[PDB]
Design a protein around this motif. Structure first.
Motif, PDB file in Angstrom:
ATOM      1  N   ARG B   1     -16.052  -0.929  59.158  1.00 22.29           N
ATOM      2  CA  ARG B   1     -16.995   0.034  58.563  1.00 22.29           C
ATOM      3  C   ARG B   1     -16.922   0.024  57.022  1.00 22.29           C
ATOM      4  N   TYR B   4     -19.632  -1.926  54.688  1.00 22.87           N
ATOM      5  CA  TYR B   4     -20.942  -2.219  55.254  1.00 22.87           C
ATOM      6  C   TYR B   4     -21.715  -0.959  55.617  1.00 22.87           C
ATOM      7  CZ  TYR B   4     -19.033  -6.946  55.969  1.00 22.87           C
ATOM      8  OH  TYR B   4     -18.497  -8.195  55.781  1.00 22.87           O
ATOM      9  N   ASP B   5     -21.467   0.164  54.927  1.00 24.64           N
ATOM     10  CA  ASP B   5     -22.079   1.431  55.335  1.00 24.64           C
ATOM     11  C   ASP B   5     -22.688   2.191  54.154  1.00 24.64           C
ATOM     12  OD1 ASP B   5     -19.667   2.126  54.163  1.00 24.64           O
ATOM     13  OD2 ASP B   5     -19.085   3.562  55.709  1.00 24.64           O
ATOM     14  N   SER B  12     -23.569  -4.473  60.169  1.00 23.22           N
ATOM     15  CA  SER B  12     -22.145  -4.764  60.262  1.00 23.22           C
ATOM     16  C   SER B  12     -21.939  -6.168  60.826  1.00 23.22           C
ATOM     17  CB  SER B  12     -21.441  -3.742  61.151  1.00 23.22           C
ATOM     18  OG  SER B  12     -20.309  -4.303  61.810  1.00 23.22           O
TER      19      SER B  12
END
Ligand code: CL
Ligand code: CL
Ligand code: CL
Ligand code: MG
Ligand code: MG
Ligand code: MG
Ligand code: MG
Lengths: 244, 232, 241, 222, 204, 250, 241, 196, 196
Positions: B1, B4-5, B12
């Protein structure tokens, strides 16, 4: 260096677009879905996981129509699929408005392909999280097509995508052997139900609901219709028998 | 996580969309709300939440037309945005086509509105869940809206914190309440029971209970306050 | 992010994204080569259909841009069809605005210029493809012009593209050094197609079936692609020396 | 105005008169109505005088840039398409009526364009107010396969018919010849049949005739 | 109302041996009413002279504009603009407004600092360049100026003579035009010097 | 789906350097050598047509490019950048000059115009500088012959001679020795070929060299006759033969 | 999306300084020195070219002193290409003011607007500042001879004598020593050349590395930009050659 | 056809402007000051189409006032009249052009010369010793052409003006309810209060 | 102007006159009113020469692009593009077009598009100022499934009548024959067709 997989339109040093490859992962985690091309049409079928007995049966339809002759089904992020289909509907309307003839199946494939490819061009959008199987009957044959988040698409004899894609492909390669002289619209419906049932064993965890549609010059007059009612039950039967 | 958030435009390495997942977390902190339907009516029950002993109880149910309405759990503003868009579509259908907007079709439109805000940079997903009920030409309907865009038709369900209680109960009571036809008071009673399986250290009051019903010959109506005493 | 992610200079003065774009051109593992006859132009490209479930007729990297221009792409099919549509458009617009048929080289220059742009504007990635254009120009005679992700374009006596690009090029160089001319002095295009398949085989060290190849010919009149059956005919003749 | 174009066996010639008029007043007795679009594409204009040189220069400018881009000799059909689509965009409000001719790598060409953007092909054309007098000549003498010397004369006689018989034309004859192998040769005042006879008197005035009030030098150097 | 016939006035320029002259009346009126007798219609930008007839507000604007343009031209080219060039500048400036044009009729006159050649030109309101070698007329008395010029004029007049001829041309034309007169001004222009004379004429 | 890069990609570093311009220069330095020489009656510009495949046809690609009938350009660095600059340059000489004054721009002004285009790639949103230096040579009536160098920063300067690209330091030093203010045009052509001769490693002949001159007017290249005052064009590219013919006298 | 690559060019440091303005100033400090001195009867502009080679042509070269107007000129220090942008907008603004009011633009109003433009690139739009500093030498019918300075921040101030570019603390210290309010133009000329010769990063001070201009008092104001020869002359007259 | 008159004597400039406002059939007001002060030594009078007339005036006013404060300086009369001409010349080719005419009188505290400017709605601008707009010139220019001297005193100017006004009262069909007179000199703008 | 198109057993033939007038002056006496939009799709132009040429030019563009992408277009597709342009632009066009084409399935097809933008598929269509005079003749002489020689004769006689009575029509008669064999051009001169 490192870093090449956080924006979209970015080439990695080994020439790849990781964000597209990551989109495929969402596709692979999706439901299994297939297409079989026959002598005068195409069949589409898809697995509807019964998450809970709370879902109304028959009532969360997944196969979508485009114009009157095109069928589309997809695996992955469902809302992306609807989006792509919506675009397909517009693209099919534009073509018919100017050219009168309803959009030929390969011409439709490139309309979708070009649009999906478009979403690999800029880091201000993400790729489509669906692989899509679609096709229909046009002024000179039936055509089945499959389209990946990359925008890659080719015409198939039969096609599969989703969790059960490998069983499906294997079962479809078999189909091109017994029944190689040609496969009729009706047998293709039956075979579709078999393959979905067989492919479901990689999702045996949940119970599921079969949904088939077809588009046959001879059985639908070339228009895309859902296999429902009696013919549907016969194919569900043919699946139970041939799985035991 | 980790890396990539930061937006809705990044997948992801396993195929997930964290921005959408974090949106669901907002629903889970929302208050419980339940919907279920027979062949003749569809019912919403919601537990309204207050802030102090001195505050009101945040409204949870919103009428969209005479035949369609919803309950919300999560960021109440986003429900305003989405329910207001739903009112506009119901109204367009009425004015241009003299046609009540099908519950199935409202569902489709909602999915598409939300999906715009998972491919758009500078946008965000909706942080709310919606239970949509209505009676249209094909009968009673209940929809569940998720910020991923996924809209689903069910016989009953529940969203919000501790919603598993009612959800589990509806899974047992299924064959019973589908058949509650031509008796609306008995479908509400069914719903008020389902939502009870999600209370913890709280009991239903006139101030926190909120109920909506719709169905054949019964325009979408909302009961609050003294009106809901009947059902406790 | 770095001078590695977008199209900006590195201290070496390099555009890494253009380089990695080039790498993606080989991602299909397919070679292509083109030669000029006396009054025709032939392109040959490998055809690799590994899936029994694919419809072989729909798998092609050779495009008919106009009535007179053929284009063969080295690189991933989505970018290749993107390039193909844009060129088909540019060629139709050229005709409307200017009244004659767009020349092969001009289209190459025009697509090369578009490539340059993705090299300088940050919001567009290059396309991972190399474009080989062939025609029999009404002014220039048989023509081969090529474009890459850097925005480069040039014309070739002959050319080849792909993972074994080097062997094919050096192969064709030697044959023109022996013959002392820049073209296949043959008046049939069928023989020129045979020359191409031949010198192709000799440099890859592999034999071909009628489904391993894909062939396009450009004449004064039009540009057409061969069928698996027209190819089988060519291969047969090659098999008889 | 009177302008014509005439095809011969290996080329094309265009000619024009030299009179420009505001209503009934001759504003220029020696206007030049033949325009270069490219070295080998010349163009004769009638109608609104500013509109012809404006539109021939615009296309010419663009044709030049097109020529450099494609490393090719410009084509008449390209001037023809670019002009007509421009005139059409302007729905007739650009009063250009043109005869465009030239040789290019595909041969020799003779077209006309009207202000609304329609075009003709032909072997002999005339436009302008003298349109009809010139065409009477053209229809009475044109034959297939003229020689450069016949075609020049035919074209020059047609302009003459306009000069004498049309009040809207015209003092001299401008001709321009575009042969296939050769350069374009542009014959300004190829024919000058209207030399003013010597005046009856000189009206040079005695110095001091004019009554002057004030006088002063003007500064130009900054 | 014809915008060319509101304020009135005339300008004329002609060529002699190694010289040019340009002249104009001084009237500015509103219809019949004479309003000013000091409305000069001849301007200069460096060694290039420009007269304008027509709607007076446009004369002023076009002068202010060509100052602006020629000023920037000198700054960027580091020379003064020449008459030939400026004619092109006026022509394209006019046509830029082809569908809403300035109601003016300019006359350009000067000697080329490098070639030595005398130069004159006139335009219509949308830019068509009449580049006569002999004389150029403009204004509400152009017809009269055409008749005066076509006789009074012979080529190669010496400056002293060119003056007499242009002056008699201007004066006698304005005296048959109800919209010109009220004074006159004549510029005689040589490669090195420029003289400006105000003429004496009827004031009615 | 739109240019969301509204911000500059070239910014000042704490050292005061504009990084991206410097790197563009680096790329120019890697480029093949090019040079220009001014004489009393002409100018010459030359570079090496080092093909990147013997199967390439060197003539299909001009590194020497006509801007106007009196202006030529050659470069060092990224060709694709140069190419779109030659296109942009030809158009500007029309749009911002020919359509206004009816004359072609004079050399300094066109150079100025190109300079402006490159300056902008140094400051506008979402773009990198150009990766080229240009040598532009031409002739106008009021300034005569002239030679200017234009860099990715947008700066220009006028030269009697200079060279850019790979062997610039060698060739710059070579030119400072052999250049005088009384050279005729044919003389500079000689010095041009010799300076290039040092910088070139493979074949060195009229098929691997590009060389053009700004000199006398060639009325034989006009295309039409009958307008006696239309002279030009002063630009001329040398033929493959004309180059070899002078290479023996080396 | 793209917000990853935005160097925020219009932000404050925690101390309240403008990163890009300060860095832009660092850039300017490596630029050829330019000096401006206001005499009781004129103004002097002198600056040093850092670009010098035998082959550089100086008759046709300008790098530091530019004419804005018949009555205003600037000495430039920084990116000459950035300077030209700013100059033309200024050259225009001056013509706009002349067109509107039929008066020449007062020196401060032009300087104010040019600094107003610079200031903008400092507060919005996300672009980089102009790497330029200006010495304005002008005369107007209200404040007479004037001397101004502007920098990348957009701030401007007026001066009796000032310097910009390289080595200004050195040069500014020299100007403070020898400057007197009652100087004539020729004194300032010599104070100007003699300051440069003491601060040059070069060996000796030669005419081929200078630009020079003076605006001084017929009852109007002439503006003179010395030619290479005129500079060579002034360099001997003062005994520096 | 309101009355806008102006005369430039040796030491000052005088503006006379009709006092009547008539909307169709009734005379609505008889005390209308058809003048705005553009700066301490520049005064502008105006007549023309309704509403356009004051709107344009007050717009030019606020614009000159803005310039005065920004530069702590008072624009010359020549420059004000040039700003005004440019503004009218823009309007004339715009969608709805201002239908306004103006006289501008100011004392140029720098040249120590008075100046009078006449500009029509088209942007036609002229510097005059005396001027009028509309029909007023038709009766008064013959008087002014006769008695006007460039070295007249302010008092002589007022007298000459009184003559013009009486000729306008005799021969002009409209009752224009008299004029308001204002003087602009080295000391600013004062309004002649006793004009009988 | 007189233009018609007729289907027969082997395909379709287009024919037209060659006269275009400005007023009563014959501006061009050999104009070619038969226009190619694709290999075997042609049209007949009537109305504004400017307008019809602009339409044909654009249709030809759209069909070239179509071909690039989707292969040979149907005659019906060509008629749709014309009809689209003409209906969507009816307020600014005076264009009356006959679209004629060939394929192997349908052989010849004819579509007429009159002023306004409607489309009408017919065995044959006539149009142009001269058409009005041959409505009676053509209706009494057309037959379905004629031979090539019969069809050329039918067209030849019809137009000769149109040309005879209509001052706006005349010159030569041009035809284009669209069959499976390819594309044949025919011309007939006055000394022939008048004697008919
Ligand atoms: Cl395609
Ligand atoms: Cl304001
Ligand atoms: Cl008015
Ligand atoms: Mg082009
Ligand atoms: Mg202007
Ligand atoms: Mg201003
Ligand atoms: Mg149209």
């Amino acid at each position: 260096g490192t870093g090449y997989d956080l924006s979209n339109s970015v080439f990695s040093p080994d020439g790849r677009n990781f964000q597209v490859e990551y989109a495929v992962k969402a596709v692979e985690n999706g439901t299994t879905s297939i297409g079989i091309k026959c002598n005068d049409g195409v069949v589409f079928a898809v697995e509807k996981l019964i998450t809970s007995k709370l879902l109304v049966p028959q009532k969360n339809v997944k196969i979508q129509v485009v114009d009157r002759h095109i069928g589309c089904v997809y695996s992955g992020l469902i809302p992306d699929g609807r989006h792509l289909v919506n675009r397909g509907r517009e693209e099919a309307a534009s073509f018919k408005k100017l050219y009168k003839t309803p959009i030929p199946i390969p011409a439709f494939a490139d309309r979708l392909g070009q649009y999906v490819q478009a979403h690999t061009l800029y880091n201000s959008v993400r790729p489509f999280g669906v692989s899509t199987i679609f096709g229909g009957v046009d002024k000179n044959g039936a055509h089945l097509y499959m389209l990946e988040p990359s925008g890659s698409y080719w015409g198939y004899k039969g096609a599969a995508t989703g969790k059960g894609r490998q069983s499906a492909k294997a079962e479809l390669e078999k189909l091109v052997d017994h029944h190689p002289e040609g496969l009729s619209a009706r047998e293709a419906v039956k075979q579709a139900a078999k393959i979905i049932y067989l492919a479901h064993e990689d999702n045996k965890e949940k119970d599921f609901e079969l949904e088939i549609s077809w588009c046959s010059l001879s059985e639908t007059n070339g228009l895309h219709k859902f296999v429902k009612g009696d013919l549907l039950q016969e194919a569900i039967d043919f699946a139970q028998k041939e799985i035991n | 996580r980790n890396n990539y958030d930061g937006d809705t435009v990044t997948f992801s390495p396993t195929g997930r969309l964290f921005q959408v997942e974090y949106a669901l977390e907002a629903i889970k902190q929302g208050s419980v709300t339940v919907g279920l339907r027979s062949n003749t009516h569809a019912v919403l029950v919601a537990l309204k939440r207050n802030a102090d002993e001195l505050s009101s109880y945040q409204k949870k149910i919103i009428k969209c037309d005479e035949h369609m309405g919803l309950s919300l759990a999560g960021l109440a503003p986003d429900a305003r945005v989405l329910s207001n868009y739903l009112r506009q579509q119901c109204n367009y259908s009425s004015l241009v086509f003299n046609r009540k907007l099908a519950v199935e079709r409202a569902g489709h439109l909602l999915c598409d509105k939300a999906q715009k805000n998972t491919q758009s940079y500078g946008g965000r997903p909706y942080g709310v869940g919606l239970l949509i009920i209505g009676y249209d030409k094909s009968g009673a309907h209940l929809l569940e809206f998720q910020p991923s865009g996924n809209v689903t038709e069910l016989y009953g369900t529940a969203i919000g914190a501790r919603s598993q209680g009612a959800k589990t109960y509806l899974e047992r009571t299924l064959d019973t309440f589908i058949k509650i036809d031509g008796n609306p008071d008995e479908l509400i009673k069914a719903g008020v029971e389902a939502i009870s399986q999600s209370l913890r250290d709280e009991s239903l009051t006139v101030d926190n209970l909120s109920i909506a019903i719709v169905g054949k010959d019964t325009p979408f109506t909302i009961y609050d306050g003294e009106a809901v005493a009947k059902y406790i | 992010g770095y001078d590695r992610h977008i199209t900006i200079f590195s201290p070496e003065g390099r555009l890494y994204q253009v380089e990695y774009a080039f790498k993606a051109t080989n991602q299909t593992n397919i070679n292509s080569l083109a030669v000029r006859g006396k009054d025709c132009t032939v392109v040959i490209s490998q055809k690799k259909v590994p899936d029994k479930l694919l419809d072989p007729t729909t798998v092609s990297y050779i495009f008919c841009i106009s009535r007179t221009i053929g284009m063969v792409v080295n690189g991933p099919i989505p970018d290749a069809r993107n390039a193909a549509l844009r060129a088909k458009a540019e060629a139709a617009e050229f005709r409307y605005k200017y009244g004659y048929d767009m020349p092969c080289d001009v289209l190459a220059k025009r697509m090369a210029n578009l490539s340059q742009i993705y090299t300088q504007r940050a919001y567009m990635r290059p396309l991972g493809v190399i474009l080989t254009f062939v025609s029999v120009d009404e002014e220039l005679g048989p023509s081969i012009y090529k474009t890459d992700p850097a925005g480069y374009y040039v014309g070739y006596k002959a050319t080849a593209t792909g993972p074994k690009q080097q062997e094919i090029t050096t192969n064709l160089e030697n044959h023109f050094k022996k013959s002392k001319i820049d073209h296949i002095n043959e008046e049939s295009w069928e023989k020129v197609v045979e020359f191409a398949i031949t010198h192709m085989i000799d440099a890859l060290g592999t034999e071909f079936s009628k489904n391993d190849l894909e062939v396009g010919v450009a004449t004064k009149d039009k540009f057409f692609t061969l069928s698996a059956e027209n190819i089988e005919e060519r291969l047969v003749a090659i098999a008889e020396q | 105005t009177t302008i014509v174009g005439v095809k011969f066996n290996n080329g094309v010639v265009i000619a024009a008169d030299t009179r420009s008029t505001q209503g009934p007043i001759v504003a220029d007795k020696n206007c030049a109505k033949l325009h270069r679009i490219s070295p080998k594409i010349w163009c004769a204009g009638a109608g609104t005088a500013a509109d012809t040189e404006a539109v021939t220069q615009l296309i010419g400018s663009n044709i030049e840039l097109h020529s450099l881009y494609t490393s090719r000799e410009p084509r008449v059909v390209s001037a023809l398409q670019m002009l007509k689509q421009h005139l059409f965009k302007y729905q007739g409000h650009i009063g250009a009526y043109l005869i465009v001719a030239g040789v290019d790598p595909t041969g020799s060409h003779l077209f006309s364009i009207h202000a609304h953007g329609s075009t003709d092909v032909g072997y002999y054309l005339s436009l302008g107010s003298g349109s009809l007098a010139a065409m009477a000549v053209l229809e009475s003498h044109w034959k297939q396969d003229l020689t450069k010397e016949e075609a020049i004369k035919l074209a020059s006689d047609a302009i003459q018919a306009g000069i004498w018989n049309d009040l809207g034309s015209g003092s001299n004859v401008d001709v321009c010849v575009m042969e296939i192998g050769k350069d374009a040769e542009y014959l300004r005042n190829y024919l000058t049949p209207n030399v003013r006879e010597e005046k009856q008197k000189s009206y040079k005035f005695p110095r001091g005739t004019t009554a002057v009030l004030k006088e002063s030098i003007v500064n130009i150097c900054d | 109302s014809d915008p060319s016939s509101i304020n009135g006035g005339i300008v004329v320029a002609m060529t002699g041996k190694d010289c040019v002259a340009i002249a104009c009346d001084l009237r500015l009126g509103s219809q019949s009413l004479g309003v000013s007798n000091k409305f000069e219609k001849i301007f200069h930008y460096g060694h290039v002279f420009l007269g304008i007839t027509g709607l007076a507000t446009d004369v002023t604007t076009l002068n202010e504009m060509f100052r602006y343009k020629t000023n920037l031209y000198k700054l960027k080219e580091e020379r003064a603009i020449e008459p030939e060039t400026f004619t092109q500048l006026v022509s394209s400036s006019l046509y830029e407004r082809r569908f809403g044009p300035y109601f003016v009729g300019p006359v350009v006159a000067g000697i080329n600092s490098k070639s030595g050649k005398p130069f004159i030109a006139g335009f219509d309101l949308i830019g068509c360049i009449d580049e006569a070698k002999d004389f150029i007329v403009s204004g509400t008395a152009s017809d009269q100026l055409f008749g005066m010029c076509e006789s009074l004029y012979e080529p190669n007049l010496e400056p002293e003579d060119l003056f007499e001829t242009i002056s008699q041309a201007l004066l006698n034309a304005a005296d048959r035009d109800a919209l010109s007169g009220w004074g006159a001004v004549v510029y005689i222009i040589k490669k090195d010097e420029v003289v400006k004379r105000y003429l004496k004429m009827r004031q009615d | 789906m739109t240019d969301r890069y509204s911000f500059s990609l070239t910014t000042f570093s704490p050292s005061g350097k504009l990084g991206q311009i410097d790197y563009a220069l680096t790329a120019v330095k890697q480029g093949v050598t090019s040079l220009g020489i001014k004489a009393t009656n002409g100018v010459v510009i030359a570079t090496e047509k080092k093909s990147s495949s013997p199967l390439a046809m060197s003539e299909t690609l001009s590194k020497v490019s006509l801007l106007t009938p009196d202006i030529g350009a050659v470069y060092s660095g990224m060709g694709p950048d140069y190419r779109v600059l030659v296109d942009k340059s030809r158009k500007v000489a029309h749009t911002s000059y020919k359509r206004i004054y009816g004359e072609y721009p004079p050399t300094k002004l066109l150079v100025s115009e190109v300079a402006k285009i490159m300056q902008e790639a140094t400051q506008s949103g979402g773009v990198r500088p150009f990766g080229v230096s240009l040598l532009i040579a031409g002739h106008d009536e009021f300034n005569g012959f002239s030679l200017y160098q234009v860099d990715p920063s947008g700066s220009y300067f006028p030269w009697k001679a200079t060279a850019i690209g790979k062997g610039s330091v060698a060739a710059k030093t070579f030119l400072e020795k052999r250049w005088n203010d009384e050279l005729e045009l044919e003389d500079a052509i000689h010095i041009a070929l010799l300076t290039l001769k040092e910088s070139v490693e493979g074949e060195f002949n009229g098929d691997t060299i590009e060389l053009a001159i700004i000199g006398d007017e060639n009325p034989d290249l006009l295309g039409y006759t009958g307008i006696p005052t239309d002279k030009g064009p002063r630009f001329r590219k040398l033929t493959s033969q004309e180059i070899n013919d002078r290479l023996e006298a080396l | 999306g793209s917000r990853r690559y935005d160097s925020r060019t219009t932000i404050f440091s925690p101390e309240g300084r403008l990163y890009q303005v300060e860095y832009a100033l660092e850039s300017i400090s490596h630029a050829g020195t330019a000096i401006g001195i206001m005499a009781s009867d004129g103004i002097v502009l002198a600056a040093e070219r850092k670009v010098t080679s035998t082959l550089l042509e100086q008759d046709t070269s300008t790098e530091k002193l530019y004419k804005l107007n018949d009555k205003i000129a600037v000495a430039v220090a920084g990116l000459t290409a950035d300077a030209e942008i700013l100059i033309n907008t200024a050259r225009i603004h001056a013509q706009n003011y002349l067109k509107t009011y039929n008066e020449d633009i007062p020196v401060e109003i032009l300087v104010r607007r040019l600094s107003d433009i610079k200031q903008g690139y400092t507060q919005h739009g996300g672009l980089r500042p102009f790497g330029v500093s200006f010495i304005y030498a002008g005369y107007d019918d209200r404040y007479g001879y004037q001397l101004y300075t502007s920098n990348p921040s957009g701030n401007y101030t007026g001066w009796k004598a000032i310097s910009v570019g390289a080595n200004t603390s050195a040069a500014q210290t020299l100007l403070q020593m020898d400057y007197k309010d009652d100087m004539k133009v020729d004194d300032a000329i010599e104070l100007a050349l003699k300051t440069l010769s003491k601060t040059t990063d070069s060996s000796a001070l030669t005419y081929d590395r200078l630009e020079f201009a003076t605006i001084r008092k017929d009852g109007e104001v002439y503006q003179k930009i010395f030619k290479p020869q005129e500079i060579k002359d002034i360099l001997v007259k003062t005994g520096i050659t | 056809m309101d009355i806008i008159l102006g005369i430039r004597v040796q030491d000052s400039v005088i503006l006379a402007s009709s006092k009547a406002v008539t909307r169709g059939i009734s005379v609505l007001k008889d005390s209308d000051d058809k003048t705005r002060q553009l700066s301490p030594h520049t005064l502008m009078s105006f007549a023309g189409e309704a509403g356009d007339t004051v709107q344009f005036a007050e717009y030019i006013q606020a614009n000159i006032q803005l310039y005065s404060i920004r530069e702590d300086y008072e624009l010359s009369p020549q420059a004000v009249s040039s700003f005004v001409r440019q503004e009218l010349a823009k309007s004339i080719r715009s969608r709805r052009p201002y239908q306004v005419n103006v006289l501008i009188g100011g004392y140029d505290k720098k040249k120590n010369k008075p100046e009078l400017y006449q500009i029509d709605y088209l942007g036609t601008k002229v510097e005059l010793p005396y001027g009028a707009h509309g029909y007023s010139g038709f009766y008064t220019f013959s008087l002014l052409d006769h008695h006007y001297r460039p070295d007249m005193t302010t008092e002589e100017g007022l007298d000459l003006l009184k003559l013009c006004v009486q000729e306008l009262e005799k021969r002009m069909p409209m009752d224009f309810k008299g004029v308001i007179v204002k003087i602009v000199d080295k000391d600013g703008i004062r309004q002649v209060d006793d004009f009988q | 102007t007189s233009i018609m198109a007729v289907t027969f057993k082997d395909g379709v033939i287009l024919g037209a006159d060659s006269r275009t007038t400005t007023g009563a002056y014959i501006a061009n006496r050999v104009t070619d009113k038969l226009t190619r939009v694709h290999d075997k799709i042609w049209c007949c132009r009537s109305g504004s020469a400017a307008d019809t040429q602009a339409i044909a030019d654009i249709v030809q563009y759209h069909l070239e692009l179509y071909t690039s992408q989707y292969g040979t277009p149907s005659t019906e597709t060509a008629a749709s593009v014309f009809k689209e342009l003409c209906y969507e632009n009816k307020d600014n066009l005076t264009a009356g077009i006959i679209v004629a084409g060939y394929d192997d399935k349908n052989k010849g097809e004819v579509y007429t598009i009159p002023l306004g933008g409607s489309v009408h598929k017919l065995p044959y269509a006539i149009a142009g100022s001269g058409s009005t005079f041959i409505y009676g003749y053509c209706d009494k002489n057309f037959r379905e499934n004629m031979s090539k020689e019969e069809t050329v004769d039918f067209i030849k006689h019809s137009l000769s009548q149109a040309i005879k009575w209509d001052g706006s029509s005349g010159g030569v008669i041009r035809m284009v024959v669209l069959t499976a064999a390819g594309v044949e051009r025919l011309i007939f001169y006055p000394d022939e067709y008048e004697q008919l």
